[PDB]
Design a protein around this motif. Structure first.
Motif, PDB file in Angstrom:
ATOM      1  N   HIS A   2      -2.819  -9.725 -19.418  1.00  0.00           N
ATOM      2  CA  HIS A   2      -2.582  -9.073 -18.137  1.00  0.00           C
ATOM      3  C   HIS A   2      -3.911  -8.682 -17.494  1.00  0.00           C
ATOM      4  O   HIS A   2      -4.829  -8.225 -18.170  1.00  0.00           O
ATOM      5  CB  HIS A   2      -1.698  -7.834 -18.315  1.00  0.00           C
ATOM      6  CG  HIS A   2      -0.344  -8.130 -18.885  1.00  0.00           C
ATOM      7  ND1 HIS A   2       0.727  -8.510 -18.102  1.00  0.00           N
ATOM      8  CD2 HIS A   2       0.116  -8.095 -20.158  1.00  0.00           C
ATOM      9  CE1 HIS A   2       1.785  -8.699 -18.871  1.00  0.00           C
ATOM     10  NE2 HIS A   2       1.442  -8.453 -20.122  1.00  0.00           N
ATOM     11  N   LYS A   4      -5.340  -6.663 -13.800  1.00  0.00           N
ATOM     12  CA  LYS A   4      -4.872  -5.905 -12.647  1.00  0.00           C
ATOM     13  C   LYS A   4      -5.042  -6.709 -11.361  1.00  0.00           C
ATOM     14  O   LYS A   4      -5.874  -7.612 -11.270  1.00  0.00           O
ATOM     15  CB  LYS A   4      -5.554  -4.538 -12.530  1.00  0.00           C
ATOM     16  CG  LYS A   4      -5.197  -3.609 -13.671  1.00  0.00           C
ATOM     17  CD  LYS A   4      -5.758  -2.210 -13.515  1.00  0.00           C
ATOM     18  CE  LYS A   4      -5.300  -1.332 -14.674  1.00  0.00           C
ATOM     19  NZ  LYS A   4      -5.950   0.003 -14.710  1.00  0.00           N
ATOM     20  N   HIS A   5      -4.226  -6.348 -10.377  1.00  0.00           N
ATOM     21  CA  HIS A   5      -4.151  -6.999  -9.086  1.00  0.00           C
ATOM     22  C   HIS A   5      -4.739  -6.098  -8.018  1.00  0.00           C
ATOM     23  O   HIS A   5      -4.093  -5.137  -7.611  1.00  0.00           O
ATOM     24  CB  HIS A   5      -2.694  -7.319  -8.761  1.00  0.00           C
ATOM     25  CG  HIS A   5      -2.095  -8.353  -9.655  1.00  0.00           C
ATOM     26  ND1 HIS A   5      -1.686  -8.086 -10.944  1.00  0.00           N
ATOM     27  CD2 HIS A   5      -1.862  -9.668  -9.451  1.00  0.00           C
ATOM     28  CE1 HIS A   5      -1.230  -9.199 -11.491  1.00  0.00           C
ATOM     29  NE2 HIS A   5      -1.315 -10.171 -10.601  1.00  0.00           N
ATOM     30  N   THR A  29      -5.624  -0.875  -7.115  1.00  0.00           N
ATOM     31  CA  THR A  29      -4.874  -2.009  -7.650  1.00  0.00           C
ATOM     32  C   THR A  29      -3.397  -1.673  -7.628  1.00  0.00           C
ATOM     33  O   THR A  29      -3.008  -0.501  -7.581  1.00  0.00           O
ATOM     34  CB  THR A  29      -5.257  -2.378  -9.102  1.00  0.00           C
ATOM     35  OG1 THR A  29      -4.805  -1.365 -10.010  1.00  0.00           O
ATOM     36  CG2 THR A  29      -6.753  -2.588  -9.254  1.00  0.00           C
ATOM     37  N   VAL A  30      -2.564  -2.699  -7.700  1.00  0.00           N
ATOM     38  CA  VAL A  30      -1.123  -2.507  -7.748  1.00  0.00           C
ATOM     39  C   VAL A  30      -0.741  -1.692  -8.987  1.00  0.00           C
ATOM     40  O   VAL A  30       0.097  -0.788  -8.919  1.00  0.00           O
ATOM     41  CB  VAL A  30      -0.383  -3.863  -7.758  1.00  0.00           C
ATOM     42  CG1 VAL A  30       1.120  -3.652  -7.879  1.00  0.00           C
ATOM     43  CG2 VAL A  30      -0.723  -4.690  -6.516  1.00  0.00           C
ATOM     44  N   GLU A  31      -1.326  -2.033 -10.128  1.00  0.00           N
ATOM     45  CA  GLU A  31      -0.982  -1.371 -11.376  1.00  0.00           C
ATOM     46  C   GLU A  31      -1.433   0.077 -11.421  1.00  0.00           C
ATOM     47  O   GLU A  31      -0.741   0.918 -11.992  1.00  0.00           O
ATOM     48  CB  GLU A  31      -1.547  -2.138 -12.574  1.00  0.00           C
ATOM     49  CG  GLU A  31      -0.917  -3.515 -12.752  1.00  0.00           C
ATOM     50  CD  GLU A  31      -1.570  -4.636 -11.958  1.00  0.00           C
ATOM     51  OE1 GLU A  31      -2.348  -4.399 -11.004  1.00  0.00           O
ATOM     52  OE2 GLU A  31      -1.290  -5.798 -12.308  1.00  0.00           O
TER      53      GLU A  31
ATOM     54  N   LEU B   6      -5.769  -9.664   1.962  1.00  0.00           N
ATOM     55  CA  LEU B   6      -5.082  -9.697   0.683  1.00  0.00           C
ATOM     56  C   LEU B   6      -3.738  -8.991   0.843  1.00  0.00           C
ATOM     57  O   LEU B   6      -3.684  -7.785   1.078  1.00  0.00           O
ATOM     58  CB  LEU B   6      -5.983  -9.032  -0.343  1.00  0.00           C
ATOM     59  CG  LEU B   6      -5.486  -8.867  -1.762  1.00  0.00           C
ATOM     60  CD1 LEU B   6      -4.887 -10.135  -2.333  1.00  0.00           C
ATOM     61  CD2 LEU B   6      -6.618  -8.336  -2.639  1.00  0.00           C
ATOM     62  N   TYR B   8       0.443  -8.557  -0.317  1.00  0.00           N
ATOM     63  CA  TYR B   8       1.484  -8.674  -1.327  1.00  0.00           C
ATOM     64  C   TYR B   8       2.834  -8.359  -0.736  1.00  0.00           C
ATOM     65  O   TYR B   8       2.995  -7.400   0.031  1.00  0.00           O
ATOM     66  CB  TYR B   8       1.277  -7.701  -2.476  1.00  0.00           C
ATOM     67  CG  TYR B   8       0.007  -7.890  -3.269  1.00  0.00           C
ATOM     68  CD1 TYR B   8      -0.161  -8.973  -4.125  1.00  0.00           C
ATOM     69  CD2 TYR B   8      -1.018  -6.976  -3.188  1.00  0.00           C
ATOM     70  CE1 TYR B   8      -1.316  -9.127  -4.860  1.00  0.00           C
ATOM     71  CE2 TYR B   8      -2.162  -7.110  -3.930  1.00  0.00           C
ATOM     72  CZ  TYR B   8      -2.309  -8.188  -4.774  1.00  0.00           C
ATOM     73  OH  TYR B   8      -3.443  -8.336  -5.531  1.00  0.00           O
ATOM     74  N   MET B  13       5.096  -6.907  -6.033  1.00  0.00           N
ATOM     75  CA  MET B  13       4.589  -5.650  -6.559  1.00  0.00           C
ATOM     76  C   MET B  13       5.608  -4.954  -7.449  1.00  0.00           C
ATOM     77  O   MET B  13       5.234  -4.431  -8.499  1.00  0.00           O
ATOM     78  CB  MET B  13       4.116  -4.744  -5.430  1.00  0.00           C
ATOM     79  CG  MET B  13       2.884  -5.299  -4.744  1.00  0.00           C
ATOM     80  SD  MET B  13       2.178  -4.179  -3.511  1.00  0.00           S
ATOM     81  CE  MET B  13       3.380  -4.375  -2.209  1.00  0.00           C
ATOM     82  N   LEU B  16       5.670  -5.945 -11.025  1.00  0.00           N
ATOM     83  CA  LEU B  16       4.578  -5.419 -11.841  1.00  0.00           C
ATOM     84  C   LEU B  16       4.796  -3.972 -12.282  1.00  0.00           C
ATOM     85  O   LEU B  16       3.990  -3.437 -13.028  1.00  0.00           O
ATOM     86  CB  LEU B  16       3.243  -5.524 -11.102  1.00  0.00           C
ATOM     87  CG  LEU B  16       2.739  -6.945 -10.877  1.00  0.00           C
ATOM     88  CD1 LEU B  16       1.566  -6.936  -9.903  1.00  0.00           C
ATOM     89  CD2 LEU B  16       2.345  -7.613 -12.187  1.00  0.00           C
ATOM     90  N   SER B  19       4.734  -3.439 -16.029  1.00  0.00           N
ATOM     91  CA  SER B  19       3.601  -4.007 -16.755  1.00  0.00           C
ATOM     92  C   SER B  19       2.955  -2.965 -17.644  1.00  0.00           C
ATOM     93  O   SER B  19       2.943  -1.789 -17.308  1.00  0.00           O
ATOM     94  CB  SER B  19       2.542  -4.491 -15.759  1.00  0.00           C
ATOM     95  OG  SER B  19       1.276  -4.684 -16.374  1.00  0.00           O
ATOM     96  N   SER B  22       0.672  -0.706 -15.813  1.00  0.00           N
ATOM     97  CA  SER B  22       1.299   0.177 -14.833  1.00  0.00           C
ATOM     98  C   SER B  22       1.829   1.469 -15.455  1.00  0.00           C
ATOM     99  O   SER B  22       2.530   2.244 -14.792  1.00  0.00           O
ATOM    100  CB  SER B  22       2.448  -0.553 -14.163  1.00  0.00           C
ATOM    101  OG  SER B  22       1.953  -1.558 -13.311  1.00  0.00           O
TER     102      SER B  22
END
Ligand code: NA
Ligand code: NA
Lengths: 162, 37
Positions: A2, A4-5, A29-31, B6, B8, B13, B16, B19, B22
């Motif tokens: 994984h 991060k985004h 980041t998204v995460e 960028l 999304y 999202m 994720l 994850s 996360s």
């Protein structure tokens, strides 16, 4: 493994109990967004009278600041919303922001949720209240993305007009 | 520098959210804002 985004922008979460804004956490980041969101109280559980705000880095949820003073807001009213519906609407707003869902996402400053008992308000703040193309695109996409109805009374207000 | 946004989608999202990356407890958060407290 994984990875991060990254987000296009850095964002900061602010919390207002009732000048008085509290800067909580920034992320990019998204995460890291989810790590924050997953651990903090949703709007349906925060103290009545408080606000959450999510703003791009270097912009505060204060309308009189240079970054906001010529701007305005799209205001969404939520009258006696259920807890899951309230929280889901706020989350979807946050995702529209951080995902850069608007063609004129550059004109976005941030969003604010006011938890106010019988009613609640979610507003999306934009930088230039006289930028017609941007204001309308953002408003239209909010209506569609959030499946807003007439009872949400989606409306645009310049900050200077209170 | 030609800019390219960028972007999304919401579903991407949301996929994720579970994850492992996360689930990190955020460091600088007042106890009053933590879930379940
Ligand atoms: Na939700
Ligand atoms: Na623009």
């Amino acid at each position: 493994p994984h990875m991060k985004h990254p987000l296009m922008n850095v964002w900061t979460l602010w919390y207002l109990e009732n000048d008085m804004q509290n800067e909580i956490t920034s992320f990019d980041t998204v995460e890291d967004f989810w790590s924050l969101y997953n651990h903090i109280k949703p709007p349906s559980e925060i103290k009545l009278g408080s606000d959450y705000s999510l703003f791009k880095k270097n912009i505060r949820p204060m309308w009189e600041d240079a970054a906001n003073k010529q701007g305005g807001r799209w205001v969404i009213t939520l009258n006696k919303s259920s807890k899951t519906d309230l929280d889901n609407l706020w989350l979807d707003v946050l995702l529209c922001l951080i995902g850069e869902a608007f063609d004129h996402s550059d004109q976005i400053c941030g969003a604010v949720i006011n938890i106010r008992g019988k009613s609640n308000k979610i507003s999306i703040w934009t930088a230039d209240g006289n930028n017609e193309e941007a204001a309308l695109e953002i408003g239209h996409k909010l209506r569609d993305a959030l499946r807003l109805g007439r009872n949400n009374s989606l409306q645009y207000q310049l900050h200077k007009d209170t | 520098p030609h800019m390219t946004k960028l972007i999304y989608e919401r579903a991407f999202m949301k996929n994720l959210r579970g994850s492992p990356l996360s689930q990190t407890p955020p460091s600088n958060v007042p106890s009053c804002l933590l879930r379940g407290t």
